[PDB]
Amino acid sequence: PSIVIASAARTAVGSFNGAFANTPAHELGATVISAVLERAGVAAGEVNEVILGQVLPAGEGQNPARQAAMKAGVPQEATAWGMNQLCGSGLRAVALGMQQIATGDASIIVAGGMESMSMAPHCAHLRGGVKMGDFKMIDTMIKDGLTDAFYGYHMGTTAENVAKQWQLSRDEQDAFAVASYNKAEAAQKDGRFKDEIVPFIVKGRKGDITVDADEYIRHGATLDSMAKLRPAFDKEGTVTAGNASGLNDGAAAALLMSEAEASRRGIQPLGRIVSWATVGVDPKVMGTGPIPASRKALERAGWKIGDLDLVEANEAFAAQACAVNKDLGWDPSIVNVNGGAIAIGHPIGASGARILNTLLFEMKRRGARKGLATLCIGGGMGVAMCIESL
Amino acid sequence: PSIVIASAARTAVGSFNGAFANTPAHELGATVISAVLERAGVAAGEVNEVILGQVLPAGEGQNPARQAAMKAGVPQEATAWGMNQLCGSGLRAVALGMQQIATGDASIIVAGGMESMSMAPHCAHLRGGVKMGDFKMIDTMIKDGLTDAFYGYHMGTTAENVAKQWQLSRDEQDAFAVASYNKAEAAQKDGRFKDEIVPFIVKGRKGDITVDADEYIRHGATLDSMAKLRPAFDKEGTVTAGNASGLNDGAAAALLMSEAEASRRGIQPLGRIVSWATVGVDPKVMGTGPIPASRKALERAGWKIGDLDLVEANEAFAAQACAVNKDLGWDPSIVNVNGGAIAIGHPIGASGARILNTLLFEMKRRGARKGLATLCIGGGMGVAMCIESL
Amino acid sequence: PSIVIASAARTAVGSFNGAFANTPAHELGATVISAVLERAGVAAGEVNEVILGQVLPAGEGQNPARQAAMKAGVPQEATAWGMNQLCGSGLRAVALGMQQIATGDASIIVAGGMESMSMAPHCAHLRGGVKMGDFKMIDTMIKDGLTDAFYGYHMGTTAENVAKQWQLSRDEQDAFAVASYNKAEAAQKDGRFKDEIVPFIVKGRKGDITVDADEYIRHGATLDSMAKLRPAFDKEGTVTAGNASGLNDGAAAALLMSEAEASRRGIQPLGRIVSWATVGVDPKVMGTGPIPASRKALERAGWKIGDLDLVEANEAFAAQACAVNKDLGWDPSIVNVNGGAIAIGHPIGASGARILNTLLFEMKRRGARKGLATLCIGGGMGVAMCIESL
Amino acid sequence: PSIVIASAARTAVGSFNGAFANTPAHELGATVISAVLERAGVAAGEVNEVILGQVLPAGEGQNPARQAAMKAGVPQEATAWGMNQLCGSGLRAVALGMQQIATGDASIIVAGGMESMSMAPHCAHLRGGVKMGDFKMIDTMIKDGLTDAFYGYHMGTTAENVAKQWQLSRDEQDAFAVASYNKAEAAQKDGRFKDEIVPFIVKGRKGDITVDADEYIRHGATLDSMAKLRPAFDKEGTVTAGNASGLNDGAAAALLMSEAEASRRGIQPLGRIVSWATVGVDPKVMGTGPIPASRKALERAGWKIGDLDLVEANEAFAAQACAVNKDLGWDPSIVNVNGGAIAIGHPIGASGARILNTLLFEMKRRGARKGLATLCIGGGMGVAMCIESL
Numbered sequence A, B, C, D: 001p002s003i004v005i006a007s008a009a010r011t012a013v014g015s016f017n018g019a020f021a022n023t024p025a026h027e028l029g030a031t032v033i034s035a036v037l038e039r040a041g042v043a044a045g046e047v048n049e050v051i052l053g054q055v056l057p058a059g060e061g062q063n064p065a066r067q068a069a070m071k072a073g074v075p076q077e078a079t080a081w082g083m084n085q086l087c088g089s090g091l092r093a094v095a096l097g098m099q100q101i102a103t104g105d106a107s108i109i110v111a112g113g114m115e116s117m118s119m120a121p122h123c124a125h126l127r128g129g130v131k132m133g134d135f136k137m138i139d140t141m142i143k144d145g146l147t148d149a150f151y152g153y154h155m156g157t158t159a160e161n162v163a164k165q166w167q168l169s170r171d172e173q174d175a176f177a178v179a180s181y182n183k184a185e186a187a188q189k190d191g192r193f194k195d196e197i198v199p200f201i202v203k204g205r206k207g208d209i210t211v212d213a214d215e216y217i218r219h220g221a222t223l224d225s226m227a228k229l230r231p232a233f234d235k236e237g238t239v240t241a242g243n244a245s246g247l248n249d250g251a252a253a254a255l256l257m258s259e260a261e262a263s264r265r266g267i268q269p270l271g272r273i274v275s276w277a278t279v280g281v282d283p284k285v286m287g288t289g290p291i292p293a294s295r296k297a298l299e300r301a302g303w304k305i306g307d308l309d310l311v312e313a314n315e316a317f318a319a320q321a322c323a324v325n326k327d328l329g330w331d332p333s334i335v336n337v338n339g340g341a342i343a344i345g346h347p348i349g350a351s352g353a354r355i356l357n358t359l360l361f362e363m364k365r366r367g368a369r370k371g372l373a374t375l376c377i378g379g380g381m382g383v384a385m386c387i388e389s390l
């Protein structure tokens, strides 16, 4: 009937081919699963199901969500499965886990997302046999994660469509990025990511290395070097590597249970899932995904846009993040207080749960009552979820 | 609420590198999605979400479930996503779509599964660079679909564990397979697969080919040549290619809606989802998955094992299929009346919905009231669902 | 000194991915080496060196010419090496082996060529590491064998340059091919290839297969179906798969020794190498290679064009073979009496020794006195050699 | 009947994945060909043929020897071809070019070798098609250059056989390496490699880099750190990365003409080829190759072992270089005065011409009369050449 979030955690967002360059996704997920359990005082033997969104699982083995649960100590009598809704996967898994408890099919869910874009392999269909000529080794990260399957161009091109449709200049996108860089670096210096980040131990041969800080956050982002970058998608476009998100590795999850079950255990939940929604749009302008999804989520919760005290909207691109702020018209000072994916990072399968962690711990830190998390999804979709504190 | 199955359809299960050797999975899903709509009198513009189970989506593009819906005519306003619970994905997706309507978040769902194991590519992580020496090109079908990620051996080895644990001789497993071949060949000659199979048109260059018959069903399976086959996993084992399922391509789905919504359209539903369950077991004996999953599903429906009039249990291996019939103790004459995965084929991500199609259409022809469909899942899991006719 | 050809042999020219689809080149060469040593009565312990031309040795191991000699029984004390002059490799090795005996550095040479275009792999430089994006798997057969390294297009395009330069219409090129097909089909039925072809035993698992007939020779080549084919290179060109050679596998070699050594052993030599030459031309019109190379060889032999009684000119393309016959002006009835590479096949590294076999055994069969063999070489070269009977 | 070396040059021997990591082999050869022509005052239009030994030509295009000649300015009228006798390719091509002029078939030859082991790709035969299972991507450098095709193990194991046959201890092999390192490091400081090295311009995007020094020569090689490496081949062996050669890139060649031709042009030849030889040995002890090859060369020159004033013997391994010096018994102080392949590097296809440059220019530097160059060849072969100054 009423589902709450008992605890939540996330790993540090590592850079592409960086600290997590050789760490499989399920190893990052296993650390987060052990974290949300310890943070709520819940043993691993009590978890009924583990739902982890993941977009690039090729080469990781049979069902990496099951591997994450077994490695984290969840017994074999429990189940685990993954799902793929691209960028909104980490947040949709929380909605899927929420329905499992609402329909009486489960009691305790560890739901979230995990992604290791560095570990994505190059593939090629070779069963038929190449009789003659050259063939391509396809990058699974680009093909299955970043390339639109209906028009053939990158997700950065869909941001160029939103830039031309909403008339967002290069200087306007760069200014939004600089605002995102400085907000994330400030939250990192003040330690506003410490409560949500669980340290990850990178198992090495010549010594272990502990990763507990987002390594993608840039220090001292200058606007002068921001405007010297060339566009990375359209030759005469406006989206660059500075005003766009990056390729990153990470994992994030939360522990789900009913409000009555949390009262039995004396747990003080981070928030209460009051509504959620997912709507589809034109794949050409997939950045506009959060616009109708946030309205559907607020309508299902009986809330107005002004009722929200804190908003976490994923910053896949600066060209797509400004239109959501302009169409919905909410106060930009309550959106991404600690920065967005332009500065922190964007692991595809885990970003849905990543911004939920940042949203939950910031609502707890400043006493916010109503929150909302939303992301844009490639192929023309968007997901949103409204959280209310208890 | 009460969720029913308005319509269901499936493509013919093709052999490995056979009729669907160059057909992507989402093209098979689009045919099944267009089928369940044209079999229930529901337009494509009414579908809210498309949930398609798939285990090997590497190289197919961004979210093949979205591509299948767009190709089938589902408008962009709707959403679509895929999920991976290995062999039970096609049936778990039906349970997930059922929960969407139960929680009031959707009205019409096209849920099922699709898999093209022939289109599965070989992958290799090459971002770090191979400084010196040879490296392996990993088969995603073997690694991500057929190899246990905890012990390293094939799923056929888990059948060898069930063989010695349940003391199932080589002659008993072959006899079960021969019975499955003769049941499937009889159902094919009598046309008991015609109502559930939607013809698929293989787009070619030198002429189109319509595929409307399961090409993996062998005619005149003899036990003499069955006992000459060598074991395909353990050198001194008992599971062979004859008493085990095969690698196949196919897709299957169903149209989900509430019982009141179906009455508003005058649709005669195939059945009513009354219960479902998923339980985990030891990965060593993953063939025992359907044993506790069917018991929890029957318990949630208020049914006994004797109340079931028709049962469809997936035959991943003859060594694993005999133990399910011995432990649950139901009458084997009502289990897989038209044959199982040993004779028809086993597309992993779609098999859960495949046996649901065979179960639904066989209940309709003989007037069965209570049914149950269940499959074993790699890594030590199992899923079951109980269907009641209207 | 005076160098003669004591004996010569060749394997049947197999089709692309045909009878020799999985046979390495050195296994084909070892059969030819064992043949020329058996057909002349020379023991393996007397061979000083083995010179085998090969263009595509990637993936076959350290020095396939050494593997061919060791497998054929030639002792380790002898030497062996391979060389690469593209299409003229099989014939240049005979000239190189001839120079070893003329300079007093050797007594008995087994020189020839071997090629397995079916075993040619796809390669990719992967030491630096592909950080992001797709990369091509380059076909070594296309890249290292059929693509000119100075202009980038196929050898069939260089035939189009000769086609436009000499004004050879589509009907004139097709008519030359039909003459070549009918000559090869007649020579195969009459058994004029039996003396030169050594049977090769294809080592298999389910039974061995003896190959002693050229499987690429097509029966009943019609001019009506010849004009139906589309151009295989230029979209509005004239060279098709019918008037051009094909991709084939095969091996050929000859036994070289001084004229005095052959008289000691009672060997009746097939012919005496009287002259040879190799000249380079423009790579765009590499088909004109045999024109100045045959003239330089005849000049070094003191022969006129009319003195030749039998000529074997390589038919890489009908557009390039007509220009050579038109420029040199020799009688077309004495040129390629038993067909050319258009009908028999064209193993690149072995074609030079293949047409030498056809010339030697046909000169012996009709009592011809003076002969000449010549080929065109990619990149703008040509090789020729004059043979005189004893 | 007397062939001299008009000029010779070589590129700096670059480390594996070092300065020449992205430089194709023929680009290094083109620099050496242009060098030997300018150093003798001979125009490119006078070269008749270019013979360049190369062992790893996969992926470089049609006949890389032809690409080196055309890029260096040699006109299209001349010919060019490559040959492969493994490690003795660079020296055998000089002997082959010598025979072209001795037999009156050519007047001016540019012969040598080129190799780019960094550019060696990974290959796999994919025409038949991998129906199921994993397959290996074979390293062409290891397979086609360093792996014995008769026993399957590395060339370092063949060095272990020579180590066990002559009873060469670990301390004895390491001492030979330190002596080679100190001789090469001293010769580089004194500038004894400046006359033979032609600077190579590495064309880059962010600035060009001039390469004129062997970057593989290690500075300050200590004997203490030499006895701290683990064996790289046998688990309980004695050959390590210190007492063995390395993987390197480089090119070297020489200008060949008759002694009368050098007089007609006023050229001061580097030396006169007086004899040459190539003998085969057991592949297990391929390091003993130079022992019987040098004896046959000295016998053909009418020289004794004491007549040699300077010797350049290739040091593929410390275990194989000590046995050759102990069996032949020549003065070690005149053998590899400036170091060997252990310190300078070992480009397979170019090492034969590399040590020939060091031999020619050191004979000129100290007034040596008689010289000899010899190498060991994998698969059980050896090549030798005797050089006398004029």
Ligand SMILES: CC(C)(COP(=O)(O)OP(=O)(O)OC[C@H]1O[C@@H](n2cnc3c(N)ncnc32)[C@H](O)[C@@H]1OP(=O)(O)O)[C@@H](O)C(=O)NCCC(=O)NCCS
Residues within 6 Å of the ligand: A087, A146, A155, A156, A218, A221, A222, A225, A226, A229, A232, A240, A241, A242, A243, A244, A245, A246, A247, A316, A346, A348, A378
């Ligand atoms: C945009 C993208 C192609 C960048 O690829 P990339 O080139 O590897 O990004 P990099 O940062 O490593 O390279 C960018 C360069 O710009 C510079 N740069 C990046 N951000 C900068 C900033 N904020 N200020 C100044 N300079 C910056 C860096 O120094 C870097 O190295 P370089 O200058 O030497 O070339 C990729 O990260 C991307 O697509 N991101 C968006 C993710 C996406 O498309 N979809 C996510 C799901 S919708």
Ligand SMILES: CC(C)(COP(=O)(O)OP(=O)(O)OC[C@H]1O[C@@H](n2cnc3c(N)ncnc32)[C@H](O)[C@@H]1OP(=O)(O)O)[C@@H](O)C(=O)NCCC(=O)NCCS
Residues within 6 Å of the ligand: B016, B087, B146, B155, B156, B218, B221, B222, B225, B226, B229, B232, B240, B241, B242, B244, B245, B246, B247, B316, B317, B346, B348, B376, B377, B378
């Ligand atoms: C067992 C398996 C490896 C077989 O591989 P396969 O070689 O492609 O199987 P094939 O049928 O194509 O070939 C098997 C051999 O047995 C023969 N054979 C198979 N079934 C036979 C039968 N019923 N009667 C007689 N002979 C039979 C085949 O003809 C073939 O012999 P052949 O060499 O003359 O062709 C594969 O089918 C498999 O793993 N299936 C199980 C899939 C799975 O694990 N799913 C998940 C379970 S949870």
Ligand SMILES: CC(C)(COP(=O)(O)OP(=O)(O)OC[C@H]1O[C@@H](n2cnc3c(N)ncnc32)[C@H](O)[C@@H]1OP(=O)(O)O)[C@@H](O)C(=O)NCCC(=O)NCCS
Residues within 6 Å of the ligand: C087, C145, C146, C155, C156, C218, C221, C222, C225, C226, C229, C232, C240, C241, C242, C243, C244, C245, C246, C247, C316, C346, C376, C377, C378
């Ligand atoms: C031209 C080339 C690319 C052909 O590609 P290909 O399609 O694999 O050639 P194929 O064997 O498949 O023949 C193709 C078609 O032409 C038809 N064909 C070929 N020769 C024919 C003939 N003589 N009469 C009628 N039809 C003919 C075949 O039947 C086939 O039709 P199909 O696809 O229905 O079977 C290849 O043979 C080639 O590159 N040749 C040149 C070799 C070369 O370059 N040598 C070095 C030059 S120096």
Ligand SMILES: CC(C)(COP(=O)(O)OP(=O)(O)OC[C@H]1O[C@@H](n2cnc3c(N)ncnc32)[C@H](O)[C@@H]1OP(=O)(O)O)[C@@H](O)C(=O)NCCC(=O)NCCS
Residues within 6 Å of the ligand: B132, D087, D145, D146, D155, D156, D218, D225, D226, D229, D232, D240, D241, D242, D244, D245, D246, D247, D316, D346, D378
């Ligand atoms: C020996 C071989 C197997 C591996 O060499 P490698 O280890 O991959 O290359 P390196 O030795 O430079 O690797 C560098 C390591 O060795 C150390 N090292 C390299 N050269 C050294 C030297 N001369 N002295 C001491 N240490 C050295 C480096 O410090 C580094 O230390 P690390 O192990 O912690 O990384 C391979 O290079 C080889 O087979 N070489 C011979 C090839 C050949 O036989 N050619 C002739 C054909 S017959």
Ligand SMILES: [Cl-]
Residues within 6 Å of the ligand: A043, A044, A045, A046
């Ligand atoms: Cl526990």
Ligand SMILES: [Cl-]
Residues within 6 Å of the ligand: A103, A105, B275, B276
């Ligand atoms: Cl339910």
Ligand SMILES: [Cl-]
Residues within 6 Å of the ligand: A210, A211, A212, A213
């Ligand atoms: Cl850190």
Ligand SMILES: [Cl-]
Residues within 6 Å of the ligand: A258, A260, A261
């Ligand atoms: Cl509850």
Ligand SMILES: [Cl-]
Residues within 6 Å of the ligand: B001, B002, B003, B258, B259, B260, B261
């Ligand atoms: Cl209802």
Ligand SMILES: [Cl-]
Residues within 6 Å of the ligand: B007, B039, B195
């Ligand atoms: Cl129907």
Ligand SMILES: [Cl-]
Residues within 6 Å of the ligand: B043, B044, B045, B046
């Ligand atoms: Cl519609």
Ligand SMILES: [Cl-]
Residues within 6 Å of the ligand: A124, A125, B058, B059, B060, B119, B120, B121
């Ligand atoms: Cl694919």
Ligand SMILES: [Cl-]
Residues within 6 Å of the ligand: A059, A121, B123, B124, B125, B138
């Ligand atoms: Cl991998």
Ligand SMILES: [Cl-]
Residues within 6 Å of the ligand: B280, B281, B282
């Ligand atoms: Cl269990």
Ligand SMILES: [Rb+]
Residues within 6 Å of the ligand: A241, A242, A243, A244, A245, A246, A342, A343
């Ligand atoms: Rb960024």
Ligand SMILES: [Rb+]
Residues within 6 Å of the ligand: B241, B242, B243, B244, B245, B246, B342, B343
């Ligand atoms: Rb089967």
